[PDB]
Amino acid sequence: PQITLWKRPLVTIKIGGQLKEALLDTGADDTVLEEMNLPGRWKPKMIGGIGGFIKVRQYDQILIEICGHKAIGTVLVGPTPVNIIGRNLLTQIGCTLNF
Amino acid sequence: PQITLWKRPLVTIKIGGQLKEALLDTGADDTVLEEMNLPGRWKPKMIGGIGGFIKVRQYDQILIEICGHKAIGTVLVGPTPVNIIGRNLLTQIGCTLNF
Numbered sequence: 797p798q799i800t801l802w803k804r805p806l807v808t809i810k811i812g813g814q815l816k817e818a819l820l821d822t823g824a825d826d827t828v829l830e831e832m833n834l835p836g837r838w839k840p841k842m843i844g845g846i847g848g849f850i851k852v853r854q855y856d857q858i859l860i861e862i863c864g865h866k867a868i869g870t871v872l873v874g875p876t877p878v879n880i881i882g883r884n885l886l887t888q889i890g891c892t893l894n895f
Numbered sequence: 896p897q898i899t900l901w902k903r904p905l906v907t908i909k910i911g912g913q914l915k916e917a918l919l920d921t922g923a924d925d926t927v928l929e930e931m932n933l934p935g936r937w938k939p940k941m942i943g944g945i946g947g948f949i950k951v952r953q954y955d956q957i958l959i960e961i962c963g964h965k966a967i968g969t970v971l972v973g974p975t976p977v978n979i980i981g982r983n984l985l986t987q988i989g990c991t992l993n994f
């Protein structure tokens with residue numbers, strides 16, 4: 797689709813059974829998602845927020861659907877305020893900026 | 896133009912005489928730029944970063960050029976780590992996300 801930017805670009809994603817609202821965020825390198833159960837193996841990672849650094853769990857090779865477009869990539873899981881789709885998944889769905 | 900997202904989407908902007916590198920950031924509501932001299936009237940604003948909240952100066956109705964596309968809008972000026980073009984200017988240049 798084509799997304800204008802007058803409003804936050806919140807889309808529905810499908811991940812690990814579940815529907816979630818998430819932000820399409822071209823200023824984010826990585827994808828970070830609120831607390832959820834993902835199956836396989838993970839490692840801990842630190843990432844920045846307004847408070848300081850939060851610890852999150854890194855799951856690699858996770859299947860996510862983003863507005864009907866399926867991607868595989870790393871998803872970080874932890875106490876983020878906002879569900880953020882970053883560039884590591886936006887490249888996977890072929891998302892560009894256009895003007 | 897059309898911008899893929901494999902790399903940070905850093906463009907050249909022209910503002911108040913000067914060339915600057917800045918991030919096209921659809922996760923940012925507002926535009927924040929490193930220390931510079933802008934003419935007219937301003938007010939102070941607080942905004943979030945990794946350390947906590949920083950004070951910035953708000954200048955309204957500023958002319959900025961972004962990859963050859965001229966926009967008018969609010970620019971915040973202060974000790975931000977990264978020059979961020981947010982949605983308040985991206986809408987002004989007709990920037991969309993596409994996939």
Ligand SMILES: [Mg+2]
Pocket residue numbers: 823824922923
């Ligand atoms: Mg951000």
